Amino acid sequence: MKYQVLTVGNPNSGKTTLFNGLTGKKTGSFVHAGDEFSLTDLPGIYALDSGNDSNSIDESIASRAVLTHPADVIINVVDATCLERSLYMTLQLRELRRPMIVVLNKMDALKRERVHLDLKQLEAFLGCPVLALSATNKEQVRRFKEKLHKLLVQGIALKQIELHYGAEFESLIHELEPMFAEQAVSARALAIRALENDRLVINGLKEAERQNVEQRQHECQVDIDLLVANVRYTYLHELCTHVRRT
Ligand SMILES: Nc1nc2c(ncn2[C@@H]2O[C@H](COP(=O)(O)OP(=O)(O)O)[C@@H](O)[C@H]2O)c(=O)[nH]1
Ligand SMILES: [Cl-]
Ligand SMILES: [Cl-]
């Protein structure tokens, strides 16, 4: 009866459009088929990260909320025109294993560029529901409400992405997953972030557990940021060639 919906995506992905279309950093609600929907439009971010460099306070707030804000579902709004760039965050959302839908927006611009994308198999690799849309189109957004409501009542079925970082990094992950098994979010996902040196995860930790984590970042023989960038990029690129066709 009362659902919390987070809107998350890159800047210029269409978030504010789809938020305004549904409801009538911005907050709002609507009703559909006898249930209530509290919507939140989180600021545009490109990764689930904050901290010293990621100066913008807005980005930290978005990162923090995705990490900790209550949510029945996170709507990942993805600009279908720059598909590969946007999907990097999508991967990280998937590693959180929070309930989530991908919304390919700006589909109108894509079909006038003679690009057809295999949303069926795109769904197969992300392992979460994938929806196509043009948020400026009133009819499709209303159709989107019915689709979203149905999913929330039916429950969202998720299979986790086959994302593998190589034996060493995988070992460091399974070393740190212990101290995250209680959290609302995948211990693996938080373990990966801790090796990635995410201020949000790390500062949450006990003084002891904090000095565990960076003991592992010295253990790693390759640059952690170099490894995750390559692995996610490779995965992304293979997927795009499989799903994008002309
Ligand atoms: N062609 C096309 N343009 C869109 C669509 N949705 C949004 N836009 C445009 O892309 C820009 C996105 O703005 P906005 O919704 O604020 O993106 P935000 O930065 O994520 O909040 C706006 O100028 C929109 O008019 C769409 O489905 N198709
Ligand atoms: Cl209910
Ligand atoms: Cl692309």
Residue numbers in the entry: 1 to 24, 39 to 260
What do the authors say?
For this bacterium, Feo is the primary system that transports Fe2+ into the cytosol. FeoA and FeoC are known to be small (ca. 7–10 kDa) cytosolic proteins, while FeoB is a large (ca. 80–100 kDa) polytopic transmembrane protein that contains an N-terminal soluble G-protein-like domain termed NFeoB. The status of GTP and GDP bound to the NFeoB region is hypothesized to control the opening and closing of the FeoB pore and therefore the translocation of Fe2+ into the bacterial cytosol.
Partial sequence alignments revealed that the position analogous to Asn150 within the G5 motif of the VcNFeoB NTPase domain is highly variable for NFeoBs known to be NTPases, while this same position is an invariant Thr residue for NFeoBs known to be strict GTPases. To test the structural basis of this hypothesis, we expressed, purified, and crystallized the G5 motif N150T variant of VcNFeoB(His)6 in the presence of GDP. The crystals diffracted to 2.9 Å resolution, and initial analysis revealed one apo VcNFeoB(His)6 NTPase domain and one GDP-bound VcNFeoB(His)6 NTPase domain both within the asymmetric unit. This hetero-oligomerization is likely crystallization induced based on our in-solution studies. Omit maps confirmed that substantial density was present and consistent with GDP in one, but not both, molecules within the asymmetric unit, allowing us to visualize a direct comparison between the apo and the GDP-bound N150T variant at the same resolution. Interestingly, the presence of Thr in position 150 affects the hydrogen bonding pattern surrounding the guanine nucleobase both directly and indirectly. First, the Thr hydroxyl moiety now makes a new hydrogen bond with position N1 along the purine ring. Second, the removal of Asn150 releases Asp122 to tighten and extend its hydrogen bonds with positions N1 and the H2N-C1 group. However, by comparison to the WT protein, the N150T variant appears to have two key additional hydrogen bonds surrounding the guanine purine that could affect nucleotide stability and may afford the discrimination of GTP relative to other NTPs. Our structure of N150T VcNFeoB(His)6 revealed increased H-bonding to the nucleobase due to the presence of Thr150 in the G5 motif, but this modification alone did not dramatically alter the binding affinity between NFeoB and GDP and only modestly increased the binding affinity between NFeoB and GMP-PNP.
